[PDB]
Amino acid sequence: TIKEMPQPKTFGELKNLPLLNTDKPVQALMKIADELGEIFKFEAPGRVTRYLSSQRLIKEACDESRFDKNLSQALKFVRDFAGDGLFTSWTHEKNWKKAHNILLPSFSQQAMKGYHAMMVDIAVQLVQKWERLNADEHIEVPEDMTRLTLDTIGLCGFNYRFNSFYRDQPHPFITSMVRALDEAMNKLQRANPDDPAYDENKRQFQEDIKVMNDLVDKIIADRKASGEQSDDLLTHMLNGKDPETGEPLDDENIRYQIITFLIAGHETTSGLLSFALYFLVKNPHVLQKAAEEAARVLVDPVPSYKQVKQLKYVGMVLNEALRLWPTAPAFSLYAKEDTVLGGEYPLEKGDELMVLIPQLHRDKTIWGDDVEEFRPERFENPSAIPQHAFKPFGNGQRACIGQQFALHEATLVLGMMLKHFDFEDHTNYELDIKETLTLKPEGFVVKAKSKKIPL
């Protein structure tokens, strides 16, 4: 039977917009979802969004015959610097399928064998940093995880060393990319974006886009001018031809792909690693079981690709961290045609949906009563998890191309962390989640006591 959709409290002509006038809009939407349930309508002047929280409805939203990836307003603002890269392109843009066909082989489980040595290079820099801390000192977790994952995708992406472990102040490119992401997300909250109040914001945004284009376009030009054939994503993009069109990517699109990969490495994997370590220090029995696996498997000074594949429990820890705090917390869909969601909610062609991944992952009909508990054992058997219950990498053909890359890096790094150190939650850290494009545990600090195992 056709149901009226719940809607949170309104602010006259501003409708629901002021509810997201916060530095934590995703956590605000999770609290709305807790109050209103599996679906709610969110209205702003000239905009309707429907927020889905239940596996019951999200399993329908994930039907690619009925729904396609939508560019959320957030992604439309990110598109001002990520262009028609894979992340901010519509499925129907020629450059989406072309880049997708060219890059899939670069992102395969098989390509990970090739990236492994460069991931180890950065992972060993992280371990060495922590081995070199003095007795009184602590680790700034998301800070060090962001140094790591930015550097990894720099090196694997285009053989470029951001040298993040040599620095306090980020590489200039990163200061521009972070400020551009911040501007993109802040613009969601401007009820009148064309105010001159926001004129300095507009001008900084253009300068930041230039910094990004200049380093990346110079990186591409330098690579073309050298003729060097390093086994990185830039080489694959310069030489690759789409089997369908027979065309290569042009230099502008390659720039967008590189900016996109840097956004991904900086924002996502670092969040996952930060949440995984958070849950391990809060669940000492789970930390011990993961530490036991790392010690049993990582028998060599340098982990091998094959050894990373054997860190099953560490992979379960990462999936459980993705369940409770999916660092990429939402994706947007549009109805390809008029359709009825869940037998109750009529949608028109073009109607926009937001999938609230943290809420999906807390659906008690799927996960049961222990849903807030950190239990990696939930992930022992992928076949025992219902369809579309677990979506930290999005859905279908528009799912994360980087999923294998991210999980290989996170497994390697967390394996080495658990092999080399005992960890202390010395401050009894109270989770405080900072929102950019992604969720990260802000101010998360630990102490690492070396097990004194040489590299």
Ligand X SMILES: C[C@@H](N)c1ccccc1
Residues that bind ligand X (CB under 6 A): 87, 260, 263-264, 267-268, 328, 400, 402, 437-438
Distance spanning both ends of the chain, measured CA to CA: 64
Q: Are 342 and 60 in contact (CB under 8 A)?
A: yes
Residues in contact with ligand GKX by the rule CB under 6 A = 20, 25-26, 44, 47, 49, 72-75, 188, 328-330, 332, 354, 437
Indicate whether 394 belongs to the interface with ligand HEM (CB under 6 A).
yes
Using CB under 6 A as the binding rule, whether residue 269 contacts ligand HEM is answered as yes
Is residue 156 flagged as an active site residue?
A: no
Nearer to ligand GKX, 41 or 97 (CB): 41
How big is the chain, counted in residues? Answer: 455
**Least distance (Å) from ligand GKX to the CB of residue 90?**
14
Residue closer to ligand GKX by CB (options 215, 263) is 263
The crossing angle, in degrees rounded to 10, of helices 199-226 and 251-264 is 110
Q: Is 156 annotated as a binding residue?
A: no
* Catalytically annotated residue among 379, 393, 423, 444: 393
- Residue 393 bears catalytic tag: yes
Q: State which of positions 55-74 bind ligand HEM (CB under 6 A).
A: 69
Residue 453, helix vs strand vs coil: coil
Compute the least distance from the CB of residue 272 to ligand X, in Å. 11
Catalytic residue chosen out of the listed positions 149, 261, 327, 400: 400
- State the binding partner of 272 from ligand X, ligand GKX, ligand HEM, none, CB within 5 to 8 A by kind: ligand HEM
Contact partner, 122, from ligand GKX, ligand HEM, ligand X, none, Cβ < 5-8 Å per class: none
| 3 state SS of 347 | strand
Kindly give, in sequence order, each residue whose CB lies less than 8 Å from that of residue 445, ignoring residues fewer than 6 positions away: 138, 139, 140, 141, 426, 427, 429
Cβ burial 180-211 (10 Å sphere, 16+ → b, else e): bbbbbbebbeeeeeeeeebeebeeebeebbeb
Kind of pairing between the strands at 421-424 and 439-441: unpaired
Cα three-residue angle 400-167-327, rounded to 5 degrees:
25
d(CA 77, CA 70): 13
Query: Is the Cβ of residue 235 or residue 403 nearer to ligand GKX in the bound state?
Result: 403
CB of 34 to ligand GKX, least distance (A): 16
51 known member of a binding site: yes
**Which one of residues 261, 275, 374, 390 is an interface residue with ligand HEM (CB under 6 A)?**
261
* Single residue of 77, 374, 405, 423 touching ligand HEM by CB under 6 A: 405
Question: Rounded to whole angstroms, how far apart are CA atoms 82 and 283?
Answer: 38
Question: Annotated catalytic, 427?
Answer: no
Query: Phi-psi region for residue 420, left (φ > 0), alpha (ψ -120 to 50) or beta?
Result: alpha
DSSP string, 220-276: HHHHHHH----SSHHHHHHH---TTT-PPPPHHHHHHHHHHHHHHIIIIIHHHHHHH
- Give whichever of 257 and 332 is closer to ligand GKX, judged by the CB atom: 332
Q: Is position 120 an interface residue for ligand HEM (rule: CB under 6 A)?
A: no
Q: How far is CA 170 from CA 145, 174, 240, 413, 439, in A?
A: 13, 6, 32, 21, 19
Residue in the structure block whose two tokens are 């349930």? 37
Q: Which of 49, 268, 327, 411 is catalytic?
A: 268
Identify what 267 binds: ligand HEM, ligand GKX, ligand X, none; CB under 5 to 8 Å per kind.
ligand X
What residues act catalytically? 268, 393, 400
Q: Which residues bind ligand HEM (CB under 6 A)?
A: 69, 86-87, 100, 153, 260-261, 264-265, 268-269, 272, 327-328, 331, 392-394, 398, 400-402, 405-406
